[PDB]
Protein backbone atom coordinates (compact mmCIF):
# COMPACT_ATOMS: atom_id res chain seq x y z
CA UNK A 1 0.00 0.00 0.00
CA UNK A 2 2.95 2.39 -0.02
CA UNK A 3 2.82 2.98 -4.10
CA UNK A 4 -0.13 5.23 -3.63
CA UNK A 5 2.41 8.01 -1.92
CA UNK A 6 4.70 8.24 -4.45
CA UNK A 7 2.37 7.57 -6.57
CA UNK A 8 -0.31 10.25 -5.72
CA UNK A 9 2.27 12.53 -4.67
CA UNK A 10 4.44 12.33 -8.36
CA UNK A 11 1.24 12.28 -10.43
CA UNK A 12 -0.79 15.41 -8.04
CA UNK A 13 2.52 17.34 -8.58
CA UNK A 14 2.76 16.79 -11.96
CA UNK A 15 -1.06 16.88 -12.95
CA UNK A 16 -0.71 20.27 -10.43
CA UNK A 17 2.30 21.61 -12.35
CA UNK A 18 1.08 20.70 -15.88
CA UNK A 19 -2.36 22.44 -15.35
CA UNK A 20 -1.31 25.19 -12.97
CA UNK A 21 1.78 25.68 -15.84
CA UNK A 22 -0.55 26.99 -17.90
CA UNK A 23 -3.09 28.58 -15.82
CA UNK A 24 -0.54 30.14 -12.99
CA UNK A 25 2.14 31.10 -13.99
CA UNK A 26 1.19 31.63 -17.59
CA UNK A 27 -1.52 34.17 -16.41
CA UNK A 28 1.53 36.73 -16.06
CA UNK A 29 1.78 36.72 -19.58
CA UNK A 30 -1.41 38.50 -19.77
CA UNK A 31 0.09 41.12 -18.38
CA UNK A 32 2.80 41.29 -21.51
CA UNK A 33 -0.35 42.42 -23.30
CA UNK A 34 -0.52 45.60 -21.22
CA UNK A 35 3.49 45.92 -22.75
CA UNK A 36 1.67 46.31 -25.87
CA UNK A 37 0.14 49.48 -24.64
CA UNK A 38 3.50 50.36 -23.00
CA UNK A 39 5.27 50.70 -26.37
CA UNK A 40 2.62 53.89 -27.04
CA UNK A 41 4.25 55.46 -24.46
CA UNK A 42 7.27 55.58 -26.62
CA UNK A 43 4.91 58.41 -28.48
CA UNK A 44 5.72 60.96 -25.65
CA UNK A 45 9.00 60.46 -25.81
CA UNK A 46 8.28 62.35 -29.03
CA UNK A 47 6.69 65.01 -27.24
CA UNK A 48 9.50 66.23 -25.87
CA UNK A 49 10.69 67.06 -29.41
CA UNK A 50 8.08 69.76 -30.24
CA UNK A 51 10.12 71.22 -27.33
CA UNK A 52 13.42 70.92 -28.74
CA UNK A 53 13.80 69.06 -31.59
CA UNK A 54 10.67 70.40 -33.77
CA UNK A 55 10.80 73.36 -31.55
CA UNK B 1 27.86 76.29 12.60
CA UNK B 2 26.33 78.53 10.45
CA UNK B 3 23.07 77.92 7.34
CA UNK B 4 22.14 80.15 4.74
CA UNK B 5 18.20 80.19 5.30
CA UNK B 6 16.34 80.24 2.67
CA UNK B 7 12.19 80.34 1.83
CA UNK B 8 10.29 78.72 -0.71
CA UNK B 9 9.52 82.25 -2.34
CA UNK B 10 12.88 83.67 -2.09
CA UNK B 11 14.85 85.10 -4.81
CA UNK B 12 16.23 83.03 -7.52
CA UNK B 13 19.63 83.67 -6.90
CA UNK B 14 20.27 82.44 -3.32
CA UNK B 15 19.09 78.85 -4.46
CA UNK B 16 20.55 79.51 -8.27
CA UNK B 17 23.56 80.85 -7.06
CA UNK B 18 24.25 79.32 -3.16
CA UNK B 19 27.36 77.91 -4.51
CA UNK B 20 28.89 80.93 -5.25
CA UNK B 21 27.81 83.04 -2.75
CA UNK B 22 28.53 80.15 0.08
CA UNK B 23 32.12 80.62 -0.80
CA UNK B 24 32.68 83.57 0.77
CA UNK B 25 30.83 82.60 3.96
CA UNK B 26 32.52 79.06 4.05
CA UNK B 27 35.84 79.69 2.62
CA UNK B 28 37.23 81.65 5.83
CA UNK B 29 37.88 77.87 7.10
CA UNK B 30 38.90 76.31 4.24
CA UNK B 31 41.38 78.11 2.98
CA UNK B 32 43.17 79.26 6.14
CA UNK B 33 44.66 76.01 7.43
CA UNK B 34 41.44 74.69 9.27
CA UNK B 35 38.79 71.70 8.79
CA UNK B 36 35.84 73.02 7.25
CA UNK B 37 32.42 71.37 5.65
CA UNK B 38 29.92 72.52 2.90
CA UNK B 39 26.35 70.51 3.83
CA UNK B 40 24.84 70.94 0.36
CA UNK B 41 21.33 69.87 0.98
CA UNK B 42 18.42 69.65 -1.08
CA UNK B 43 19.85 69.78 -4.50
CA UNK B 44 17.03 69.27 -6.92
CA UNK B 45 15.16 72.37 -5.17
CA UNK B 46 18.18 74.25 -6.51
CA UNK B 47 19.54 73.15 -9.45
CA UNK B 48 16.19 73.53 -10.92
CA UNK B 49 15.99 77.01 -9.26
CA UNK B 50 17.61 78.07 -12.88
CA UNK B 51 15.40 76.60 -15.20
CA UNK B 52 12.69 79.15 -14.38
CA UNK B 53 15.38 82.33 -15.16
CA UNK B 54 15.98 80.06 -18.49
CA UNK B 55 12.47 79.46 -20.38
CA UNK B 56 11.08 82.59 -19.54
CA UNK B 57 14.05 84.02 -21.50
CA UNK B 58 13.09 82.34 -24.78
CA UNK B 59 16.21 79.67 -24.26
CA UNK B 60 16.38 75.88 -24.25
CA UNK B 61 19.63 74.34 -23.39
CA UNK B 62 19.38 71.73 -21.07
CA UNK B 63 16.30 68.67 -20.27
CA UNK B 64 12.60 69.03 -19.66
CA UNK B 65 13.39 72.98 -19.89
CA UNK B 66 16.47 73.85 -18.33
CA UNK B 67 20.07 75.24 -18.10
CA UNK B 68 23.57 74.38 -18.99
CA UNK B 69 24.45 74.17 -14.99
CA UNK B 70 24.94 70.21 -15.24
CA UNK B 71 28.23 70.54 -17.16
CA UNK B 72 29.57 74.08 -16.12
CA UNK B 73 28.53 74.77 -12.79
CA UNK B 74 28.92 71.14 -11.86
CA UNK C 1 -4.66 65.23 -64.89
CA UNK C 2 -6.71 68.33 -66.08
CA UNK C 3 -7.93 69.86 -69.24
CA UNK C 4 -6.01 72.74 -70.29
CA UNK C 5 -8.16 75.24 -71.85
CA UNK C 6 -5.80 78.12 -72.81
CA UNK C 7 -2.02 77.27 -72.19
CA UNK C 8 -1.43 80.84 -69.79
CA UNK C 9 -0.36 81.13 -66.21
CA UNK C 10 2.83 82.43 -65.74
CA UNK C 11 6.23 81.89 -64.83
CA UNK C 12 7.08 80.21 -61.92
CA UNK C 13 9.90 80.92 -58.26
CA UNK C 14 11.27 78.55 -56.08
CA UNK C 15 11.82 75.00 -57.26
CA UNK C 16 13.00 73.48 -54.14
CA UNK C 17 12.29 69.51 -53.33
CA UNK C 18 8.55 68.54 -53.90
CA UNK C 19 7.30 71.97 -53.32
CA UNK C 20 5.81 73.53 -56.92
CA UNK C 21 5.89 76.98 -55.50
CA UNK C 22 5.44 78.29 -59.30
CA UNK C 23 3.56 81.61 -59.73
CA UNK C 24 1.25 81.03 -62.43
CA UNK C 25 -2.02 83.72 -62.21
CA UNK C 26 -2.50 86.84 -60.10
CA UNK C 27 -6.49 86.69 -59.11
CA UNK C 28 -7.24 83.52 -61.26
CA UNK C 29 -6.48 80.45 -59.53
CA UNK C 30 -7.76 77.16 -60.04
CA UNK C 31 -9.67 74.58 -58.04
CA UNK C 32 -8.35 71.82 -55.92
CA UNK C 33 -8.63 69.30 -58.46
CA UNK C 34 -7.68 71.18 -61.21
CA UNK C 35 -3.56 70.74 -61.91
CA UNK C 36 -1.45 73.11 -63.87
CA UNK C 37 0.60 70.94 -66.95
CA UNK C 38 3.51 72.70 -66.54
CA UNK C 39 5.98 72.32 -69.20
CA UNK C 40 8.99 71.17 -66.85
CA UNK C 41 11.91 69.96 -68.58
CA UNK C 42 10.48 67.73 -72.01
CA UNK C 43 7.07 66.16 -70.48
CA UNK C 44 3.73 68.21 -69.19
CA UNK C 45 3.99 67.41 -65.17
CA UNK C 46 1.55 68.24 -63.80
CA UNK C 47 1.16 69.07 -60.06
CA UNK C 48 -2.37 69.00 -58.09
CA UNK C 49 -2.87 72.42 -56.03
CA UNK C 50 -3.62 71.34 -52.45
CA UNK C 51 -4.07 74.83 -51.41
CA UNK C 52 -4.42 77.77 -53.13
CA UNK C 53 -2.10 81.35 -51.85
CA UNK C 54 -2.84 84.86 -52.98
CA UNK C 55 -0.11 86.26 -55.38
CA UNK C 56 0.64 83.49 -57.56
CA UNK C 57 2.89 80.89 -55.63
CA UNK C 58 0.39 78.61 -54.38
CA UNK C 59 1.00 75.49 -52.44
CA UNK C 60 0.90 72.53 -55.29
CA UNK C 61 2.08 68.94 -54.59
CA UNK C 62 3.27 66.93 -57.93
CA UNK C 63 3.16 63.64 -58.10
CA UNK C 64 6.17 62.14 -60.25
CA UNK C 65 8.79 64.96 -60.81
CA UNK C 66 10.08 67.40 -62.92
CA UNK C 67 12.60 65.99 -64.61
CA UNK C 68 15.10 68.57 -64.32
CA UNK C 69 13.82 72.26 -64.68
CA UNK C 70 14.93 75.87 -64.11
CA UNK C 71 13.48 78.50 -62.08
CA UNK C 72 10.88 79.57 -63.89
CA UNK C 73 9.23 76.89 -65.77
CA UNK C 74 5.49 78.28 -67.80
CA UNK C 75 2.62 76.81 -66.42
CA UNK C 76 -0.73 76.35 -68.22
CA UNK C 77 -4.34 77.19 -66.75
CA UNK C 78 -7.34 74.60 -66.83
CA UNK C 79 -11.00 74.11 -67.07
CA UNK C 80 -12.25 70.60 -65.86
CA UNK C 81 -11.11 69.35 -62.62
CA UNK C 82 -9.55 66.17 -62.46
CA UNK C 83 -10.33 64.54 -66.36
CA UNK C 84 -8.90 61.50 -66.22
CA UNK C 85 -9.94 58.84 -68.70
CA UNK C 86 -12.03 55.47 -67.21
CA UNK C 87 -15.43 53.80 -67.53
CA UNK C 88 -16.73 50.43 -67.45
CA UNK C 89 -14.41 49.24 -70.20
CA UNK C 90 -11.50 48.83 -68.45
CA UNK C 91 -12.02 45.15 -67.49
CA UNK C 92 -9.41 43.70 -70.12
CA UNK C 93 -6.13 44.88 -69.27
CA UNK C 94 -4.31 45.88 -66.58
CA UNK C 95 -4.17 49.59 -65.15
CA UNK C 96 -1.86 52.73 -64.50
CA UNK C 97 -2.19 55.26 -61.45
CA UNK C 98 -3.62 57.82 -63.96
CA UNK C 99 -5.93 55.73 -66.26
CA UNK C 100 -3.57 54.35 -68.44
CA UNK C 101 -2.15 51.04 -68.95
CA UNK C 102 0.69 48.76 -67.50
CA UNK C 103 0.78 45.93 -69.81
CA UNK C 104 -0.07 46.84 -73.14
CA UNK C 105 -1.62 49.24 -75.23
CA UNK C 106 -5.31 51.09 -75.30
CA UNK C 107 -4.57 53.08 -72.10
CA UNK C 108 -6.75 50.32 -70.32
CA UNK C 109 -9.55 50.16 -72.54
CA UNK C 110 -10.54 54.22 -73.46
CA UNK C 111 -14.02 54.97 -73.00
CA UNK C 112 -15.52 57.39 -71.26
CA UNK C 113 -13.69 60.57 -69.78
CA UNK C 114 -15.26 62.13 -66.72
CA UNK C 115 -14.66 63.57 -63.88
CA UNK C 116 -11.86 61.40 -61.83
CA UNK C 117 -13.04 62.53 -57.98
CA UNK C 118 -16.48 60.31 -57.42
CA UNK C 119 -19.29 60.31 -54.65
CA UNK C 120 -18.43 58.97 -51.60
CA UNK C 121 -21.51 58.04 -48.92
CA UNK C 122 -24.89 59.18 -50.38
CA UNK C 123 -28.43 58.02 -49.08
CA UNK C 124 -31.53 59.15 -51.18
CA UNK C 125 -31.49 56.79 -54.27
CA UNK C 126 -28.92 54.49 -52.76
CA UNK C 127 -30.10 50.71 -51.10
CA UNK C 128 -30.37 51.87 -47.35
CA UNK C 129 -32.05 48.18 -46.50
CA UNK C 130 -28.31 46.71 -46.91
CA UNK C 131 -29.01 42.99 -48.10
CA UNK C 132 -27.01 40.50 -47.86
CA UNK C 133 -24.94 38.10 -50.03
CA UNK C 134 -24.03 34.83 -51.15
CA UNK C 135 -20.77 33.75 -52.13
CA UNK C 136 -21.54 29.97 -52.58
CA UNK C 137 -19.24 28.24 -50.50
CA UNK C 138 -19.85 25.61 -47.68
CA UNK C 139 -17.30 27.48 -45.54
CA UNK C 140 -17.54 31.22 -46.46
CA UNK C 141 -21.22 31.89 -47.20
CA UNK C 142 -22.60 29.25 -44.69
CA UNK C 143 -20.17 30.63 -41.44
CA UNK C 144 -20.39 34.08 -42.42
CA UNK C 145 -23.35 36.29 -43.71
CA UNK C 146 -21.84 38.79 -45.85
CA UNK C 147 -24.13 42.08 -47.07
CA UNK C 148 -24.65 42.71 -50.04
CA UNK C 149 -21.43 45.75 -51.51
CA UNK C 150 -19.94 45.59 -47.88
CA UNK C 151 -15.97 46.23 -46.86
CA UNK C 152 -15.06 42.53 -45.33
CA UNK C 153 -11.86 43.14 -43.80
CA UNK C 154 -9.21 40.13 -44.16
CA UNK C 155 -6.83 38.83 -41.05
CA UNK C 156 -4.40 35.64 -40.86
CA UNK C 157 -1.72 34.64 -42.42
CA UNK C 158 -1.18 32.50 -45.55
CA UNK C 159 -3.03 29.23 -46.88
CA UNK C 160 -5.62 30.40 -49.09
CA UNK C 161 -3.82 32.98 -51.46
CA UNK C 162 -4.20 35.06 -54.77
CA UNK C 163 -4.93 32.46 -56.60
CA UNK C 164 -8.15 30.47 -54.32
CA UNK C 165 -9.85 33.80 -54.37
CA UNK C 166 -9.46 34.94 -57.18
CA UNK C 167 -9.31 31.77 -59.40
CA UNK C 168 -12.48 30.86 -56.76
CA UNK C 169 -13.84 34.51 -56.84
CA UNK C 170 -13.40 35.08 -61.04
CA UNK C 171 -15.88 32.09 -61.60
CA UNK C 172 -18.66 31.45 -58.98
CA UNK C 173 -19.40 35.40 -57.98
CA UNK C 174 -19.26 36.08 -61.93
CA UNK C 175 -21.64 33.25 -62.99
CA UNK C 176 -23.41 33.47 -59.97
CA UNK C 177 -24.43 37.35 -60.18
CA UNK C 178 -23.89 39.84 -62.58
CA UNK C 179 -20.90 42.23 -62.39
CA UNK C 180 -17.45 43.16 -63.22
CA UNK C 181 -15.07 42.07 -60.27
CA UNK C 182 -11.98 44.54 -60.63
CA UNK C 183 -8.58 45.15 -58.26
CA UNK C 184 -6.09 47.42 -56.98
CA UNK C 185 -2.65 47.66 -55.53
CA UNK C 186 -0.40 50.27 -54.01
CA UNK C 187 3.07 49.08 -52.65
CA UNK C 188 3.55 45.93 -54.41
CA UNK C 189 7.13 44.61 -55.39
CA UNK C 190 8.50 44.77 -59.14
CA UNK C 191 9.03 41.33 -59.57
CA UNK C 192 5.68 40.07 -58.47
CA UNK C 193 3.82 41.92 -61.39
CA UNK C 194 6.00 39.45 -64.07
CA UNK C 195 4.63 36.27 -61.64
CA UNK C 196 1.01 37.01 -60.20
CA UNK C 197 -0.09 38.21 -63.66
CA UNK C 198 0.74 34.72 -64.97
CA UNK C 199 -2.16 33.79 -62.83
CA UNK C 200 -4.27 35.62 -65.02
CA UNK C 201 -3.09 33.26 -67.75
CA UNK C 202 -4.96 30.13 -65.68
CA UNK C 203 -8.13 31.48 -64.56
CA UNK C 204 -9.33 33.91 -67.57
CA UNK C 205 -10.00 36.88 -65.36
CA UNK C 206 -7.39 39.56 -67.45
CA UNK C 207 -10.36 40.05 -69.15
CA UNK C 208 -12.69 40.76 -66.80
CA UNK C 209 -10.60 42.46 -63.97
CA UNK C 210 -8.49 45.95 -64.30
CA UNK C 211 -5.21 45.43 -62.27
CA UNK C 212 -4.22 48.85 -61.19
CA UNK C 213 -1.27 48.34 -59.35
CA UNK C 214 1.98 50.78 -58.52
CA UNK C 215 4.54 48.70 -57.59
CA UNK C 216 6.75 50.66 -55.36
CA UNK C 217 9.41 52.05 -57.20
CA UNK C 218 7.76 55.76 -57.69
CA UNK C 219 7.77 58.32 -54.50
CA UNK C 220 4.38 58.98 -52.23
CA UNK C 221 2.32 61.21 -54.62
CA UNK C 222 3.15 59.04 -57.64
CA UNK C 223 2.09 55.32 -56.36
CA UNK C 224 -0.65 56.97 -53.59
CA UNK C 225 -2.75 58.25 -56.29
CA UNK C 226 -4.68 54.87 -57.53
CA UNK C 227 -7.88 56.15 -55.52
CA UNK C 228 -9.60 58.19 -58.49
CA UNK C 229 -9.08 54.67 -60.97
CA UNK C 230 -10.92 52.41 -58.35
CA UNK C 231 -13.20 55.07 -57.52
CA UNK C 232 -13.87 56.59 -60.98
CA UNK C 233 -13.72 53.41 -62.65
CA UNK C 234 -15.61 51.73 -60.40
CA UNK C 235 -18.71 53.72 -60.68
CA UNK C 236 -19.46 53.63 -64.63
CA UNK C 237 -20.44 49.86 -63.97
CA UNK C 238 -22.23 49.51 -60.17
CA UNK C 239 -24.32 52.82 -61.26
CA UNK C 240 -25.21 51.06 -64.87
CA UNK C 241 -26.79 47.78 -64.16
CA UNK C 242 -23.70 45.75 -62.84
CA UNK C 243 -22.41 45.49 -59.44
CA UNK C 244 -18.80 46.67 -58.95
CA UNK C 245 -15.93 45.01 -56.62
CA UNK C 246 -12.15 46.09 -56.04
CA UNK C 247 -9.80 44.90 -54.04
CA UNK C 248 -7.39 46.78 -51.98
CA UNK C 249 -3.65 45.42 -51.57
CA UNK C 250 -1.75 46.78 -48.12
CA UNK C 251 -2.54 49.60 -46.13
CA UNK C 252 1.29 50.70 -46.06
CA UNK C 253 1.26 52.57 -48.95
CA UNK C 254 -1.72 54.69 -47.67
CA UNK C 255 -1.06 54.66 -44.26
CA UNK C 256 3.05 55.55 -44.72
CA UNK C 257 2.45 57.63 -47.59
CA UNK C 258 -0.53 59.96 -45.99
CA UNK C 259 1.07 59.80 -42.53
CA UNK C 260 4.96 60.66 -43.53
CA UNK C 261 3.54 62.80 -46.44
CA UNK C 262 1.31 64.60 -44.45
CA UNK C 263 3.40 65.21 -41.10
CA UNK C 264 6.42 66.10 -43.05
CA UNK C 265 5.46 68.91 -44.94
CA UNK C 266 5.88 71.38 -41.87
CA UNK C 267 2.16 71.12 -40.48
CA UNK C 268 1.27 69.42 -37.17
CA UNK C 269 -1.11 66.43 -37.04
CA UNK C 270 -2.52 63.06 -34.81
CA UNK C 271 0.08 61.50 -32.32
CA UNK C 272 1.72 58.33 -32.17
CA UNK C 273 3.41 59.10 -35.57
CA UNK C 274 -0.01 59.46 -37.13
CA UNK C 275 -1.92 61.95 -39.62
CA UNK C 276 -4.84 63.89 -39.30
CA UNK C 277 -6.41 63.14 -42.30
CA UNK C 278 -7.23 58.90 -40.99
CA UNK C 279 -10.54 60.09 -40.22
CA UNK C 280 -11.49 61.75 -43.50
CA UNK C 281 -10.39 59.10 -45.46
CA UNK C 282 -10.89 55.95 -43.65
CA UNK C 283 -14.67 56.99 -43.11
CA UNK C 284 -15.25 58.87 -46.10
CA UNK C 285 -13.48 56.10 -48.29
CA UNK C 286 -15.13 53.21 -46.01
CA UNK C 287 -18.59 53.97 -46.39
CA UNK C 288 -18.29 55.09 -50.24
CA UNK C 289 -18.52 50.88 -50.71
CA UNK C 290 -22.46 50.69 -50.12
CA UNK C 291 -25.01 49.08 -52.00
CA UNK C 292 -27.29 51.08 -54.07
CA UNK C 293 -30.21 50.76 -56.42
CA UNK C 294 -28.40 49.94 -59.64
CA UNK C 295 -25.73 48.03 -58.14
CA UNK C 296 -23.99 46.91 -54.99
CA UNK C 297 -20.09 48.61 -54.60
CA UNK C 298 -18.33 45.75 -52.71
CA UNK C 299 -14.56 46.51 -52.02
CA UNK C 300 -12.03 43.63 -50.66
CA UNK C 301 -10.58 45.66 -47.27
CA UNK C 302 -7.26 43.80 -47.52
CA UNK C 303 -5.24 46.47 -45.18
CA UNK C 304 -2.86 45.60 -42.84
CA UNK C 305 -2.30 46.37 -39.41
CA UNK C 306 1.02 47.59 -37.70
CA UNK C 307 1.80 44.12 -35.93
CA UNK C 308 -1.71 44.78 -34.12
CA UNK C 309 -1.15 48.27 -33.13
CA UNK C 310 -4.16 49.26 -30.77
CA UNK C 311 -2.85 52.21 -29.68
CA UNK C 312 -2.87 53.67 -33.19
CA UNK C 313 -5.40 53.81 -36.31
CA UNK C 314 -4.55 50.33 -37.48
CA UNK C 315 -6.94 48.44 -34.77
CA UNK C 316 -9.49 51.73 -34.30
CA UNK C 317 -9.97 52.20 -38.17
CA UNK C 318 -10.14 48.79 -39.62
CA UNK C 319 -11.71 47.05 -36.80
CA UNK C 320 -14.39 50.23 -36.72
CA UNK C 321 -14.77 51.06 -40.19
CA UNK C 322 -14.64 47.14 -41.67
CA UNK C 323 -17.61 44.75 -40.87
CA UNK C 324 -16.17 41.41 -40.76
CA UNK C 325 -12.73 39.60 -40.58
CA UNK C 326 -12.05 36.54 -41.32
CA UNK C 327 -9.00 34.84 -40.24
CA UNK C 328 -7.04 32.22 -41.76
CA UNK C 329 -4.43 30.09 -39.78
CA UNK C 330 -1.76 27.83 -40.88
CA UNK C 331 -3.60 24.93 -38.79
CA UNK C 332 -6.57 24.20 -41.64
CA UNK C 333 -3.81 24.46 -43.82
CA UNK C 334 -1.15 22.26 -42.67
CA UNK C 335 -2.95 19.22 -42.46
CA UNK C 336 -3.99 18.96 -45.98
CA UNK C 337 -7.38 20.85 -46.23
CA UNK C 338 -8.77 22.77 -49.10
CA UNK C 339 -10.79 25.88 -46.97
CA UNK C 340 -7.51 27.31 -44.87
CA UNK C 341 -10.20 29.72 -43.36
CA UNK C 342 -11.23 28.43 -39.71
CA UNK C 343 -14.70 28.74 -38.03
CA UNK C 344 -13.32 30.46 -35.32
CA UNK C 345 -13.61 34.25 -35.25
CA UNK C 346 -14.88 34.37 -39.10
CA UNK C 347 -18.17 35.60 -38.56
CA UNK C 348 -20.51 38.76 -38.84
CA UNK C 349 -22.85 40.38 -36.32
CA UNK C 350 -26.20 39.00 -38.19
CA UNK C 351 -24.63 35.74 -38.90
CA UNK C 352 -24.41 34.00 -35.41
CA UNK C 353 -27.12 36.15 -33.54
CA UNK C 354 -30.85 36.23 -33.89
CA UNK C 355 -31.44 38.14 -36.71
CA UNK C 356 -31.61 35.91 -39.05
CA UNK C 357 -33.56 32.71 -39.39
CA UNK C 358 -33.62 29.15 -37.83
CA UNK C 359 -31.24 28.03 -40.40
CA UNK C 360 -28.40 29.95 -39.67
CA UNK C 361 -29.23 30.41 -36.02
CA UNK C 362 -29.12 26.40 -35.62
CA UNK C 363 -26.17 26.13 -38.07
CA UNK C 364 -23.92 28.41 -36.60
CA UNK C 365 -24.85 27.63 -32.82
CA UNK C 366 -24.46 24.31 -33.66
CA UNK C 367 -21.04 24.63 -35.50
CA UNK C 368 -19.68 26.66 -33.19
CA UNK C 369 -21.31 24.58 -30.17
CA UNK C 370 -19.69 21.35 -31.45
CA UNK C 371 -16.45 23.08 -32.89
CA UNK C 372 -16.04 25.05 -29.82
CA UNK C 373 -17.05 21.87 -27.22
CA UNK C 374 -15.49 19.32 -29.38
CA UNK C 375 -12.06 21.15 -30.40
CA UNK C 376 -10.53 20.39 -26.60
CA UNK C 377 -11.65 16.97 -26.67
CA UNK C 378 -8.92 15.88 -29.16
CA UNK C 379 -6.36 18.68 -28.31
CA UNK C 380 -6.59 18.63 -24.57
CA UNK C 381 -7.11 14.80 -23.88
CA UNK C 382 -4.39 13.29 -26.44
CA UNK C 383 -1.91 14.78 -23.19
CA UNK C 384 -3.48 11.74 -21.18
CA UNK C 385 -5.18 9.23 -23.31
CA UNK C 386 -7.70 7.54 -24.85
CA UNK C 387 -9.37 5.34 -22.29
CA UNK C 388 -12.17 7.95 -20.78
CA UNK C 389 -13.20 8.51 -24.66
CA UNK C 390 -17.56 8.17 -24.14
CA UNK C 391 -19.97 8.69 -26.75
CA UNK C 392 -19.27 12.36 -26.85
CA UNK C 393 -15.28 12.14 -27.77
CA UNK C 394 -16.15 9.22 -30.22
CA UNK C 395 -19.34 11.60 -31.33
CA UNK C 396 -17.67 15.20 -31.20
CA UNK C 397 -14.43 13.97 -32.78
CA UNK C 398 -16.09 11.50 -35.70
CA UNK C 399 -18.00 14.40 -36.08
CA UNK C 400 -15.98 17.59 -35.85
CA UNK C 401 -13.46 15.63 -38.14
CA UNK C 402 -15.66 14.51 -40.90
CA UNK C 403 -17.48 17.76 -40.88
CA UNK C 404 -14.56 19.99 -40.41
CA UNK C 405 -12.96 17.88 -43.35
CA UNK C 406 -15.70 17.02 -45.22
CA UNK C 407 -16.93 20.72 -45.50
CA UNK C 408 -14.59 22.16 -47.08
CA UNK C 409 -15.92 22.29 -50.50
CA UNK C 410 -13.98 22.65 -53.80
CA UNK C 411 -15.04 25.68 -56.17
CA UNK C 412 -13.57 26.74 -59.49
CA UNK C 413 -10.39 27.54 -58.68
CA UNK C 414 -9.20 24.09 -59.14
CA UNK C 415 -11.23 23.27 -61.96
CA UNK C 416 -8.96 24.82 -64.51
CA UNK C 417 -5.66 24.88 -62.14
CA UNK C 418 -5.52 21.13 -60.79
CA UNK C 419 -8.72 19.38 -62.15
CA UNK C 420 -10.88 18.83 -59.37
CA UNK C 421 -14.62 19.89 -59.28
CA UNK C 422 -17.34 20.51 -56.99
CA UNK C 423 -19.16 23.39 -58.83
CA UNK C 424 -20.53 25.78 -55.99
CA UNK C 425 -21.87 25.14 -52.50
CA UNK C 426 -25.74 25.46 -51.74
CA UNK C 427 -26.78 26.92 -48.66
CA UNK C 428 -29.38 24.37 -48.46
CA UNK C 429 -26.94 21.43 -47.99
CA UNK C 430 -24.45 23.21 -46.15
CA UNK C 431 -27.15 24.62 -43.71
CA UNK C 432 -29.87 21.30 -43.42
CA UNK C 433 -27.21 19.12 -43.47
CA UNK C 434 -24.21 20.26 -40.56
CA UNK C 435 -26.26 21.22 -38.44
CA UNK C 436 -28.18 17.30 -38.18
CA UNK C 437 -26.12 15.13 -39.67
CA UNK C 438 -23.03 16.12 -38.19
CA UNK C 439 -23.64 16.02 -34.61
CA UNK C 440 -24.79 11.94 -33.90
CA UNK C 441 -26.75 11.01 -37.11
CA UNK C 442 -26.31 8.84 -39.75
CA UNK C 443 -22.02 7.77 -39.27
CA UNK C 444 -21.41 6.04 -42.30
CA UNK C 445 -19.28 8.96 -43.99
CA UNK C 446 -15.28 8.11 -43.43
CA UNK C 447 -12.43 10.77 -43.50
CA UNK C 448 -11.07 9.10 -47.33
CA UNK C 449 -14.40 9.39 -48.86
CA UNK C 450 -15.70 12.37 -47.46
CA UNK C 451 -12.61 14.43 -49.15
CA UNK C 452 -13.62 16.73 -51.79
CA UNK C 453 -17.16 16.86 -51.77
CA UNK C 454 -19.71 19.53 -52.30
CA UNK C 455 -20.76 20.67 -48.65
CA UNK C 456 -23.55 17.60 -47.57
CA UNK C 457 -24.87 17.08 -51.22
CA UNK C 458 -22.13 14.95 -52.44
CA UNK C 459 -21.11 13.23 -49.16
CA UNK C 460 -24.00 11.52 -48.94
CA UNK C 461 -23.76 9.25 -52.00
CA UNK C 462 -19.74 9.21 -51.04
CA UNK C 463 -20.39 6.40 -47.83
CA UNK C 464 -22.25 4.09 -49.61
CA UNK C 465 -20.64 4.28 -53.20
CA UNK C 466 -17.30 4.38 -52.16
Known amino acids: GVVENLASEQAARMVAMKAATDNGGSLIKELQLVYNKARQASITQELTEIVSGAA | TIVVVATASESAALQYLAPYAGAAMGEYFRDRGEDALIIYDDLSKQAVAYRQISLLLRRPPGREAFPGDVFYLH | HH??????????????????????????????????????????????????????????????????????????????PIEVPVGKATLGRIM????????????????????????????????????????????????????????????????????????????????????????????????????????????????????????????????????????????????????????????????????????????????????????????????????????????????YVPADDLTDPSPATTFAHLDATVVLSRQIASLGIYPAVDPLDSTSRQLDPLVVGQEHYDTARGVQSILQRYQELKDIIAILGMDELSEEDKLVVARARKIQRFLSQPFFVAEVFTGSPGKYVSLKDTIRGFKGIMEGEYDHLPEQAFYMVGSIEEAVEKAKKL
Not at chain 3, 7 to 35: L, N
Open chain 3, 96 to 303: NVLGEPVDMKGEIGEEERWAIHRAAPSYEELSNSQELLETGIKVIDLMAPFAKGGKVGLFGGAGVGKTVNMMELIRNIAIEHSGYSVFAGVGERTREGNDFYHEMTDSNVIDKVSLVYGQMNEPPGNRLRVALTGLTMAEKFRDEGRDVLLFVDNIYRYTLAGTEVSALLGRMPSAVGYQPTLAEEMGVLQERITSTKTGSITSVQAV
Open chain 3, 3 to 80: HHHGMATGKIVQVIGAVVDVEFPQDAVPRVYDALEVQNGNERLVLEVQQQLGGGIVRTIAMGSSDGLRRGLDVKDLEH
